[PDB]
A paper describes a structure:
In recent years, the emergence of imine reductases (IREDs) has had a substantial impact on the application of enzymes in the preparation of chiral amines of pharmaceutical interest. IREDs are NAD(P)H-dependent oxidoreductases that catalyze the asymmetric reduction of prochiral imines, but in certain cases also enable the reductive amination of prochiral ketones through catalysis of both imine formation and subsequent reduction of the iminium ion intermediate. The enzyme designated IR77 by France and co-workers in a previous work has 100% sequence identity with NCBI accession sequence WP_053252429, annotated as an “NADP-binding domain” from the nitrogen-fixing bacterium Ensifer adhaerens, also known as a species of Sinorhizobium. The enzyme adopts the canonical fold now well established for IRED structures. An N-terminal Rossmann domain (residues 1–164) connects to a C-terminal helical domain (195–294) through a long alpha-helix (165–194). Two monomers closely associate in a domain swapping arrangement that serves to form two active sites per dimer, each at the interface of one N-terminal domain with the C-terminal domain of its partner.
The structure of IR77 was determined, and using this as a basis, structure-guided mutagenesis, coupled with point mutations selecting improving amino acid sites suggested by other groups, permitted the identification of a mutant A208N with improved activity for amine product formation. Crystals of IR77 A208N were obtained in the P212121 space group with two molecules in the asymmetric unit constituting one dimer. The dimer featured one more open active site and the other more closed, and more resembling the conformation observed with those in the wild-type structure. Following building and refinement of the structure, electron density for the cofactor NADP+ was again clearly visible within the active sites at each dimer interface. Position A208N is observed at the interface of the C-terminal helical domain of one monomer and the N-terminal domain of its partner. Introduction of the mutation has resulted in new H-bonding interactions between the N208 side chain and those of T133 and N156 in the partner monomer. However, the Km of 0.94 mM was greater than those recorded for wt-IR77 and A208S of 0.61 and 0.60 mM, giving 60% of the catalytic efficiency of wt-IR77 in this case. The lower catalytic efficiency of A208N over A208S is compensated for by the greater stability observed by the former. An increase in melting temperature (Tm), measured using nano-DSF, of 8.2 °C was observed upon binding of cofactor, over 2 °C greater than the difference observed with wt-IR77 and 1 °C greater than A208S. This improvement in stability is illustrated in the capability of IR77 A208N to withstand significantly greater substrate loadings than either wt-IR77 or A208S.
Author numbering:
A (entry chain A): 2 to 293
B (entry chain B): 1 to 295
The structure:
């Protein structure tokens, strides 16, 4: 089994390193702040002191830093670049499809194979069967080294050959996540302003989460089939949503909780109603997301 | 199956409550502004009152389930009804605001009635099932004295405190979580359409990652309850990498002419947290910046 290098030992870079070690890979790590990489030494990692050293130790280089601008400062420096020849670079950093494409062109021009990924996981999911990572780029590199990706999670998937696909789907899945989390921020604010124990909110969310998961799956299934008009299988219709949402708005007004996000919800509800969708399926709101 | 229960409102949800009281063997008295809508409950064993005042006089417990609190007011504050509320337990299960709950608590007490305010977190189908969820707030004694009645409405009926507005507030909060996930869905769909991604693919990715999102939300609630805004060893994610990736979604929505009213809201909260030193704190730190930037 070949040696794997990991550039970045933040929360997520460390989790990747831990999973490689658990699977019995010689794992070489590097981090701008060397102090943060020590605990992986304790676990069996070799700590490289320099990028160039980490790149020379291994045939596969998994990058997990803040952004592609950072990855550039690391890999595009004169004293690293010549070391990339013959290597597989796996950019698991978050980015834009353009960034994936720009990095694909550049890595190829300097003699290295490339995969661009997006980790659809928190660190606790890495190295578990449920662990999801999306990979895009040439198929051969993923097929030749499949056991390495299998170490990272049971649901690491090659989803296409155009490098930017992982980053594109990622932005969509992150939009879902941000939606749920800022709804959390709204709920937490409402409970704090109304003197509601947040441990109670946490019990209420554990009870309703599975229903809300179904409401979101149904919204996607219906939008894919154009089924915007309410029917017998409708779970969620615009009228009752819009009606109850008035109560949340009134509460947030009274407690001076910021309404910029909910006023956003309200503008989408109102465009759909102004177009006769008041008793249509929630999925009809998918027609009213555009700028103008 | 001992005391008599009246239900005002036989709409979709009012009916389900009445059906569940009958299933449990309660003498059930119903009334509806549209008489015709209450007939099917007669066939099931309900006595149909012709007037509100008659429905209120028949029973010691009055469950109200109408459209809005303005409606409840019309019904209960009428000269011919009000004096009949003396010694009654009124259980307002209509959806409303915490202020509405509070205004009704004050008023009901002034006219000599005990009060509970509720919010139903269930569709009519799940009323009278073990899963059936209803939140109640107000004085505890009335709930504890009549607990078998609430058990009839569902297995997961809960008294959550003494301040009457808690039920309506917790309801709005649970729905804010739901709306957050759904409008996130609307955003994700829109991004897929603009990038020519099969929505069947988004649907498979959601089945794969829903638990990751569910854990992020649970963790955000647990940490906010303990004030843990500083990033630590147990942190799942922190503000800097969130704000970094969120830049890519903003740029994409600009380029594909997707409406940004909602994400610009996210962006203002990210900015206030960073301006106050939380760039590398836990996501939970954003919870400190949900207040109106005003005054
Ligand atoms: N955490 C999650 O749940 C999650 C989910 C999926 C994807 N991701 C993505 O994975 C990446 C890592 O996130 P994380 O949670 O691990 O964040 P983090 O804990 O803040 O880790 C940041 C990492 O980037 C490095 N870095 C920052 N600026 C750099 C620069 N100019 N040059 C070199 N290295 C630099 C840090 O080095 P120092 O330690 O030297 O500062 C560290 O290795 C991000 O793109 C994130 O969006 C995160
Ligand atoms: N359906 C659900 O799944 C669900 C779930 C949770 C919460 N809820 C809440 O339950 C409550 C009842 O809604 P629903 O689903 O039963 O709605 P619905 O089917 O529209 O029933 C509306 C009811 O309100 C009555 N009403 C409205 N205005 C009135 C007035 N001014 N005077 C007298 N009666 C009046 C109606 O009388 P008419 O029959 O004469 O119009 C009818 O009984 C709402 O607050 C709703 O938010 C419903």
């Amino acid at each position: 089994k070949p040696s794997i290098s990991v550039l970045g030992t933040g929360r997520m870079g460390s989790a990747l390193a831990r999973a490689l070690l658990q699977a019995g890979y010689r794992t070489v790590v590097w981090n701008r702040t060397s102090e943060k990489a020590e605990p992986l030494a304790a676990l069996g990692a070799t700590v490289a002191p320099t990028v160039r050293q980490a790149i020379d130790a291994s045939g596969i280089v998994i990058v997990n830093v803040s952004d592609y601008a950072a990855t550039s400062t690391l890999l595009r420096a004169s004293d690293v670049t010549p070391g990339l020849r013959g290597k597989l670079i796996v950019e698991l950093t978050s980015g834009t499809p353009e960034g994936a494409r720009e990095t694909s062109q550049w890595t190829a021009a300097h003699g290295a194979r490339y995969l661009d990924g997006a980790i659809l996981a928190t660190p606790d999911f890495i190295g578990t069967d449920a662990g999801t990572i999306l990979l895009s780029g040439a198929l051969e590199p993923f097929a030749a080294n499949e056991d390495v990706f299998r170490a990272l999670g049971g649901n690491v998937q090659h989803i296409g050959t155009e490098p930017g696909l992982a980053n594109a789907l990622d932005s969509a899945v992150l939009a879902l996540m941000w939606g749920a989390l800022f709804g959390g921020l709204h709920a937490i604010a409402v409970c704090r302003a109304e003197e509601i124990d947040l441990g109670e909110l946490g019990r209420q969310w554990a009870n309703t989460a599975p229903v809300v998961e179904g409401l979101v799956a149904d919204l996607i299934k219906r939008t894919s089939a154009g089924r915007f008009v309410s029917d017998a299988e409708t779970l969620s219709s615009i009228s009752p949503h819009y009606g109850a949402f008035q109560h949340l708005k009134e509460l947030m007004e009274a407690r001076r909780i910021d309404r910029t996000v909910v006023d956003g919800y309200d503008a989408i509800f109102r465009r759909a109603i102004a177009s006769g969708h008041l008793h249509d399926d929630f999925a009809a709101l998918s027609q009213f997301m555009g700028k103008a």
